[PDB]
Amino acid sequence: QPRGYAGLRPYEKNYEGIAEADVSALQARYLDQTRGRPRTGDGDTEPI
Amino acid sequence: WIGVNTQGSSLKNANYDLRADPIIPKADVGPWMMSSVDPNIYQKPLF
Amino acid sequence: AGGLSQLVAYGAQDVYLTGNPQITFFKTVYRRYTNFAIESIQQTINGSVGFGNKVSTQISRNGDLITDIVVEFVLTKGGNGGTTYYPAEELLQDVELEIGGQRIDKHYNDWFRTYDALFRMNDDRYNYRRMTDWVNNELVGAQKRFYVPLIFFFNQTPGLALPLIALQYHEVKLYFTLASQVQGVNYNGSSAIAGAAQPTMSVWVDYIFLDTQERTRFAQLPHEYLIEQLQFTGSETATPSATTQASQNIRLNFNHPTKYLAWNFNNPTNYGQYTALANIPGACSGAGTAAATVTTPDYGNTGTYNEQLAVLDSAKIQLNGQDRFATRKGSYFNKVQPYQSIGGVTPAGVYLYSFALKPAGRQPSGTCNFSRIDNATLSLTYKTCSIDATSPAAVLGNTETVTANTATLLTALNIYAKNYNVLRIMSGMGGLAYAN
Amino acid sequence: AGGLSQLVAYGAQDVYLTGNPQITFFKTVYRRYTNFAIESIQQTINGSVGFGNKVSTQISRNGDLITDIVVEFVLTKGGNGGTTYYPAEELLQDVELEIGGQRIDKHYNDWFRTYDALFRMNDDRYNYRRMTDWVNNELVGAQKRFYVPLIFFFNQTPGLALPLIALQYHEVKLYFTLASQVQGVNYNGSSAIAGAAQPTMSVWVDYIFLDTQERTRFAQLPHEYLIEQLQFTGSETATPSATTQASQNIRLNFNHPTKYLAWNFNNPTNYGQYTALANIPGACSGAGTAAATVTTPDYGNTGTYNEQLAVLDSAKIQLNGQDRFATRKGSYFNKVQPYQSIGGVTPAGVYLYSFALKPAGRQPSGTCNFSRIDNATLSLTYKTCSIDATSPAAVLGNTETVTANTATLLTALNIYAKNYNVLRIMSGMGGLAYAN
Amino acid sequence: EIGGQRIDKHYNDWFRTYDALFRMNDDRYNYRRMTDWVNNELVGAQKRFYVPLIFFFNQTPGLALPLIALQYHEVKLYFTLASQVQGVNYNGSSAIA
Amino acid sequence: ATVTTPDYGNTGTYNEQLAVLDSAKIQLNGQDRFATRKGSYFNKVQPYQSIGGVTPAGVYLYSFALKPAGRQPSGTCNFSRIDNATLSLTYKTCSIDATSPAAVLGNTETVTANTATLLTALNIYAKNYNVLRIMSGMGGLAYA
Amino acid sequence: VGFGNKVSTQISRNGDLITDIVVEFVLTKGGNGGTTYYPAEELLQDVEL
Amino acid sequence: QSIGGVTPAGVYLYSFALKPAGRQPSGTCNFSRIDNATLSLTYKTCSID
Amino acid sequence: VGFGNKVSTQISRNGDLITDIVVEFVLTKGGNGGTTYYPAEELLQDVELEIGGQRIDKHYNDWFRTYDALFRMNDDRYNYRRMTDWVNNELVGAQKR
Amino acid sequence: GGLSQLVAYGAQDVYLTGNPQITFFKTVYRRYTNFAIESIQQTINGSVGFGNKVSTQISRNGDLITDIVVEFVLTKGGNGGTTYYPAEELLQDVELEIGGQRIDKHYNDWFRTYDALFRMNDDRYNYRRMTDWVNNELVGAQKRFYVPLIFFFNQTPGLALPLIALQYHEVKLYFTLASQVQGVNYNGSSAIAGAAQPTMSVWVDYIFLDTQERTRFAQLPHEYLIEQLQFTGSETATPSATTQASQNIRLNFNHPTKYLAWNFNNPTNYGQYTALANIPGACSGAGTAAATVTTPDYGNTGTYNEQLAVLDSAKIQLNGQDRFATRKGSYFNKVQPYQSIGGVTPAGVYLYSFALKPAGRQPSGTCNFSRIDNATLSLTYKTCSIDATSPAAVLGNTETVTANTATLLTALNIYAKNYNVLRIMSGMGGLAYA
């Protein structure tokens, strides 16, 4: 055969797409607590 | 996954009456027609 | 050059196809087989043959094994071309197969029609029609010999040849019922045909002759043959109406591993009519003209692919109260099921549902064992019969959920199930392996 | 609910279908195969091609193995649509296969017609017709290229690829005879067509290019190919009389383990005419109208399924004076045999009797060894030719034992037998294992 | 598409070409019945058509896609519907009101 | 009869005279893969040999496989190792007056209907074998 | 979503457990008062779990 | 969902509780730990005669 | 999709990472030039971004207008306007993507 | 899709992607110091008014300062088209004093020259919106203008002046307000009766630093590489309609200079760097019967029509040797800015850079005039032969000529921008070089 393989028109062995879970894992909860009252936090405890 | 059979192949020849029938152990009496029906014994009868 | 330009085009993408090759295509190996011959032998019919009569035959042990069985009939046309529809098929009303006195199976004229509609095809189907009907515009008085092959399990393949040689103490008998009437032969609709001839009948069995050692093994060894059986019950239909969509839930009193269910809706007096009559070409006697009557079919053109004349809107099979599959339209069972499972074309009004991948073969390919279902049922919904059948425009231009007013004449429902069992032969005797 | 409800429904009757499973339907493993390439290479033709000429070709050693061979022709129409019938098939009067100077096989135009009539079917048959005739109402002067694939044993499957590579000292040649006349091409019945073109011809051979290891093995190793051969003799027909039923006993000078016999009756004047001419649609030139004649066929509609025009009432094959099988009617051979053994539809006038379970295949499945039978005889009973062919009522309304008076023109009988032999190749030379 | 990777793609013309070449006899006729009106239906007629796909797994059980072995990959089909369908919403270049 | 619009219900046909391909060859790496064959060879013979069906005029097939309709590899052309691949076509002369029926039905091998000129699109398809690898919950094609 | 259509939803994992599910519909009257009867009920032909 | 009665138009409820109509302390929203709890309203257009 | 409707899409897992996202619309002119103002921007009333069911962010048509008003500029701003409005005096009935 | 490109890889890619160093798909942001920025009003000392000198001291409110914006409120003394960047004209000059040392100084004309060369696109447009009336305002309209200062610390936080490190030194801004502003209190030579005096306010944007950063600035020595403006005015070798005027100016410049810049102007009209003409926008009423080539269309004073410019060609000679070959005036107007800035410079304004990128902060080549005895700018002027009242005469003419009205551009302004070092240590600052 006169022409050797030029190498053009290549391919990539075992190309998998990005993993897509079907289970649809639960959303991650936050790390910062809810900004409640800024100056009167955690009750007052009124006396008699 | 879909659940065990609470009936299965047992209710093919069930008892009309409420007096529990005498259990006949199915054990290939004939080498021809084998009769795949189950025995269907009552769990807690009327007594 | 030439083909060599392809051979040199070799690399990693070829390894999965040709690396470490296992086979070639350019040298085939035929297998050596036993010494056998096939002989067609006439059997004696015990009883009188005629319309409405019932006769039987015992198959002689002429050879060692039996395969094909063909019943020959001779009929004369009682009217002109277009008056008959597969009349030799209609004639053989039913056949029972009995081995050792046990009923192994039973086929019905309608089954032969349903079976054909689903499983035969192309020229195979036409050639069949040529053996059961008049298809070259023959005229009244024309005489023809018909050949009705039987479709019992041992008639399907050499592989299930019935080992008569291994059944030394049991006889094998066929029982054939001939129809009281056959359309276009002895009756035209309800009218008797004066001068109609009674059929001539003969039963032929094609017997396999084995060599000395092959014969010995069959005669002496026990054999378990996987066979097919047909379960069948005829019943009334929740007759479709022009006023409402009828529905019906039919308890399926079936047992055994079932390959498939098959059914059709028909006019009880018109053999092979699975569709409504209409004034569209071929759909009724006289269709296409002023004289068209939508109370009588064009018998020679009874079968049709025009779905508009079918009556099933939708159906599902329910097992123990649970859906087995999603409800599908009647057209699914008629067109897709056989497309997928058979590869032929099914006439309108005939339906199939397979529980198997390849129900048309002999090899098991998935089954529904009804011996393990408490309450199986076929749930059917019918189309509204609001279309005026005497007006082709009304028929040809209508919608998916409606049909001909004449569709309410399809009051009969035939439900079949084809299943497996085992025919055990031992010590010279044989009978069905599982009772239910 | 759903498919899971079927799986859970498991019983004793499932054990014989799925217990201790051996296979699965969902994991097909394909076999790795030896690398190869296929090239269609034109062969030369030694001698000018034309009507009545004898020409030949030597197959070049371009590749290693060969299979399919297609003969191309270019023909012109000498009349309008309806005047030709398989003219390229008619033209290729015969072909001989020769290896090392010795005959291996020989096929004839009539065989190609008989072969097609029995073994091709459905669309395959139509596609074939499209390559041998004009099927789209082409008119006089029309020109096209027609292909006639050969049917020698190596032309039907890669499994029998002829090892030209292992025949280093033996040439392989095909000899072709062109018909002196071809209907609707250079002659209209007996009348030559002025200006008719001579056929253009080309022979193409499909070659297999093997990889290094496979090529080497074929070149060096001896080979045994179990192949088919066609035996053929044309003979005098006990032509039917209008006064009685002609009968005949034909000694069959056949040899070898025969797969099947096949035969036809014909009018040698009109290629492919296996039936009587008649004034019923398609059965004669102008049939159905005022211009109808029963002296000339409607060539484009020469073949028919109307058995009323066939000449065989019944037949049996005798072996050394022993009936092989009970005498059966002509329609058994025409309709039942091919139903059972092929699965296609056979036209009237063409008959088949198999000694094999599957005559349409390549795997041996029971044969009749005529080399062990001194006297093999085909016993024929003909229909009475008393029906007035010019009166469609007379034909269409006739009886089983009679035919058209024009049936008397079917004076030629062609009897074929296909058999097995072994083609052996060794040390660059080859031929057949058995001489007869 | 499997796992976001394009495995294959067919075109209406491919289905027509494929059919023209690889289907036959009654399978082809039935195919036509599942895609067209072949009983001389008239204007206003309604039918449900079934167009089987011709991907490798749609041809044999032997190649059934193992959804079971694709715990992290979806198998999806994407479809394009024709701008016009002859005799349904357009007649040659004319729209059908 | 208007030869600008088909009888839609009868759009397809087996009438070769209306086909437009006179002949063709496939050339690989500058050298012929097979000798040029007529359009009717691709339309009728290839399908005869390789499929056993009947192909409508205007549709062509060239197989590299013994049985292309099946699933089992039976010969393939690996274009991934071929630097140059070309389909070479010769078309029929569209000189036949399509509106005058005899002109079509009575014509020769290398010509067709003038309306042939309207078939301006060419669709070329190829079918190949790849491997879908599946493991550990994921997969894809071995050869991208 | 529309008349005669088959539609579906996969329930997202926003929370850990679920209870109440409500399908909202927007309908427009095709006639006057007295011409409908629980039409949102008639509309939801069925629901599978 | 939370009461089982019928509420007149113009009266609105949003529960933070499973059973707000009862005595039992099903779930609650603690505003003593929330910085600016805000009720966001969108009104209908009052265009009708 | 239509006026006043709420629609959504899940981003297909075809590539590994995502950046630019462009929403295409085809709008027509209901009047002559001078009657519209960034209508594709006006049409997209808002967009909300969610990951794993959690809100990450949300933009509003007015925000797009404010954002543009503050952060785009020069020919970036003009090219942007060209992508959301009709700026070559197009007339009633005109269609644009 | 995209995979088909990834696979298209070979030896030619190695230089671009082999042994990869970076990606574009993951950014590392750099943690920065803790700071805040506040805009604080300074008190203006002295008396604000036209022609008055005022000053302000920057208060120690924050630690560092950057941007400074001078607000002015002016009222139109005439209709639209009568003003041209009037807030710029008003801020005649500003001097920067640190520790009693003169660090730098800008002039209204520099603000105009600087803008003409270095601002661009919508920066320039937004910039005009803050110093002029650009929405066809009418007489009496009142607007607050915002004039940013352009001292080194007013352009980048990188050079924020560390007032914190200058505990002992005052930082002051001395401002001169123009005696007249066109279209505000004067119209050409005429005063506008009823014109209001300006309202002025100086705003300084101060950076508040957290403890560690503030301490380092307060205690450590610093060397800030800053830029300064040098400027001298010269009499122009006034163009003539009979010949080509020429001039050679020894530039009293020093320090590593990033660039020189200059213009010719009519001192009568702020921003007029070109000749007047009866072509649209080139004079008051241009294009019609009422056109006067003695007064500009003030709102359109600047133009890109080089025909009205007066520089034919120029070169810079250093100690008797040519620094570069003589180039045409349009080189200095169009090419230099193309190459070095990327903006578009108005006719009559010229630039010659010694720097690769003079518009930036980072030194990129300088000419140190502290080592040059005779830095001379050689200017060749066009012949003012064109009859400015005839648009055909102007628009259809040749390269070497200009308008007869070009002889009014009698003032020459030459600027230079250099680098120096502002040293700060032990609470005090000052320049390393004089």
Side-chain angles (χ1 to χ4, degrees), chain J residues 45 55-58 94-99 170-174:
Chain J
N45 301 323
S55 67
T56 186
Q57 182 181 351
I58 61 171
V94 57
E95 180 176 350
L96 175 65
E97 183 182 84
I98 301 177
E170 299 292 354
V171 178
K172 296 188 178 184
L173 304 172
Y174 294 86

Short mmCIF file of all heavy atoms in Angstrom, two decimals, chain J residues 45 55-58 94-99 170-174:
data_model
loop_
_atom_site.label_atom_id
_atom_site.label_comp_id
_atom_site.label_asym_id
_atom_site.label_seq_id
_atom_site.Cartn_x
_atom_site.Cartn_y
_atom_site.Cartn_z
N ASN J 45 -10.12 76.91 52.67
CA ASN J 45 -9.58 78.09 53.30
C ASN J 45 -9.67 79.18 52.26
O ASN J 45 -9.65 78.89 51.07
CB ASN J 45 -8.12 77.91 53.62
CG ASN J 45 -7.82 76.80 54.50
OD1 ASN J 45 -8.53 76.47 55.45
ND2 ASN J 45 -6.71 76.18 54.21
N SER J 55 -7.39 77.45 49.29
CA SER J 55 -6.56 76.29 49.57
C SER J 55 -7.23 75.36 50.53
O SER J 55 -8.14 75.74 51.25
CB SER J 55 -5.22 76.75 50.13
OG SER J 55 -5.36 77.35 51.39
N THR J 56 -6.78 74.14 50.59
CA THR J 56 -7.34 73.25 51.58
C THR J 56 -6.28 72.35 52.14
O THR J 56 -5.31 71.97 51.47
CB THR J 56 -8.53 72.46 51.01
OG1 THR J 56 -9.14 71.72 52.04
CG2 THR J 56 -8.09 71.54 49.94
N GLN J 57 -6.46 72.01 53.39
CA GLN J 57 -5.56 71.16 54.12
C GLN J 57 -6.22 69.83 54.29
O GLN J 57 -7.38 69.79 54.69
CB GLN J 57 -5.30 71.81 55.46
CG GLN J 57 -4.36 71.12 56.37
CD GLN J 57 -4.27 71.91 57.64
OE1 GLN J 57 -4.79 73.03 57.72
NE2 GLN J 57 -3.65 71.36 58.63
N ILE J 58 -5.52 68.75 54.00
CA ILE J 58 -6.20 67.49 54.14
C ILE J 58 -6.17 67.01 55.58
O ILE J 58 -5.11 66.85 56.17
CB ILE J 58 -5.66 66.46 53.14
CG1 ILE J 58 -4.15 66.25 53.47
CG2 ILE J 58 -5.86 66.96 51.71
CD1 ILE J 58 -3.48 65.13 52.75
N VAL J 94 -3.93 73.50 40.30
CA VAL J 94 -3.85 72.93 41.63
C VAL J 94 -2.44 72.52 41.99
O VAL J 94 -1.81 71.72 41.29
CB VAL J 94 -4.84 71.76 41.82
CG1 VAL J 94 -4.60 70.68 40.79
CG2 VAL J 94 -4.70 71.21 43.27
N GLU J 95 -1.95 72.99 43.12
CA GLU J 95 -0.60 72.66 43.56
C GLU J 95 -0.61 71.74 44.76
O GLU J 95 -1.36 71.95 45.71
CB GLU J 95 0.18 73.93 43.85
CG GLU J 95 1.59 73.72 44.32
CD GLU J 95 2.31 75.02 44.48
OE1 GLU J 95 1.79 76.03 44.07
OE2 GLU J 95 3.36 75.02 45.06
N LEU J 96 0.21 70.70 44.69
CA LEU J 96 0.34 69.72 45.76
C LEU J 96 1.56 69.98 46.61
O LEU J 96 2.71 69.90 46.12
CB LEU J 96 0.47 68.31 45.17
CG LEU J 96 0.72 67.16 46.14
CD1 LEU J 96 -0.48 66.97 47.07
CD2 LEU J 96 1.02 65.92 45.31
N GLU J 97 1.32 70.24 47.89
CA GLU J 97 2.39 70.55 48.82
C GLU J 97 2.44 69.55 49.96
O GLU J 97 1.44 69.29 50.63
CB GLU J 97 2.16 71.94 49.40
CG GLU J 97 3.22 72.46 50.36
CD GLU J 97 2.86 73.83 50.89
OE1 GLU J 97 2.12 73.89 51.85
OE2 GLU J 97 3.32 74.81 50.36
N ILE J 98 3.61 68.96 50.19
CA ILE J 98 3.75 67.99 51.28
C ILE J 98 4.91 68.40 52.15
O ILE J 98 6.05 68.42 51.70
CB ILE J 98 3.93 66.53 50.77
CG1 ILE J 98 2.69 66.15 49.90
CG2 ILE J 98 4.12 65.55 51.97
CD1 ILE J 98 2.72 64.78 49.25
N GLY J 99 4.64 68.74 53.40
CA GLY J 99 5.71 69.13 54.30
C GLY J 99 6.32 70.47 53.93
O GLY J 99 7.49 70.74 54.18
N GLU J 170 1.98 68.33 56.78
CA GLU J 170 0.71 68.67 56.21
C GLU J 170 0.72 68.34 54.75
O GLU J 170 1.77 68.43 54.09
CB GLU J 170 0.41 70.16 56.35
CG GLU J 170 0.36 70.70 57.76
CD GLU J 170 -0.78 70.21 58.57
OE1 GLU J 170 -1.65 69.52 58.05
OE2 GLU J 170 -0.82 70.49 59.73
N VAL J 171 -0.44 68.00 54.24
CA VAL J 171 -0.62 67.82 52.83
C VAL J 171 -1.67 68.81 52.41
O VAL J 171 -2.80 68.77 52.90
CB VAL J 171 -1.05 66.39 52.49
CG1 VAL J 171 -1.28 66.26 50.97
CG2 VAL J 171 0.04 65.44 52.98
N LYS J 172 -1.29 69.70 51.51
CA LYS J 172 -2.20 70.74 51.10
C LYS J 172 -2.38 70.82 49.60
O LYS J 172 -1.50 70.45 48.81
CB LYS J 172 -1.74 72.09 51.62
CG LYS J 172 -1.75 72.21 53.13
CD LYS J 172 -1.47 73.61 53.56
CE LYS J 172 -1.53 73.76 55.06
NZ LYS J 172 -1.33 75.17 55.47
N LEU J 173 -3.54 71.33 49.24
CA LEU J 173 -3.88 71.59 47.86
C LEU J 173 -4.15 73.06 47.69
O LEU J 173 -5.02 73.63 48.35
CB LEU J 173 -5.13 70.83 47.48
CG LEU J 173 -5.13 69.34 47.68
CD1 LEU J 173 -6.52 68.86 47.42
CD2 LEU J 173 -4.13 68.66 46.74
N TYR J 174 -3.41 73.70 46.81
CA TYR J 174 -3.64 75.12 46.60
C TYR J 174 -4.32 75.27 45.28
O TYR J 174 -3.84 74.77 44.27
CB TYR J 174 -2.33 75.88 46.64
CG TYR J 174 -1.69 75.87 47.97
CD1 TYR J 174 -0.87 74.83 48.33
CD2 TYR J 174 -1.92 76.90 48.85
CE1 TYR J 174 -0.28 74.83 49.56
CE2 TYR J 174 -1.32 76.90 50.08
CZ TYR J 174 -0.49 75.87 50.43
OH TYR J 174 0.14 75.87 51.67
#
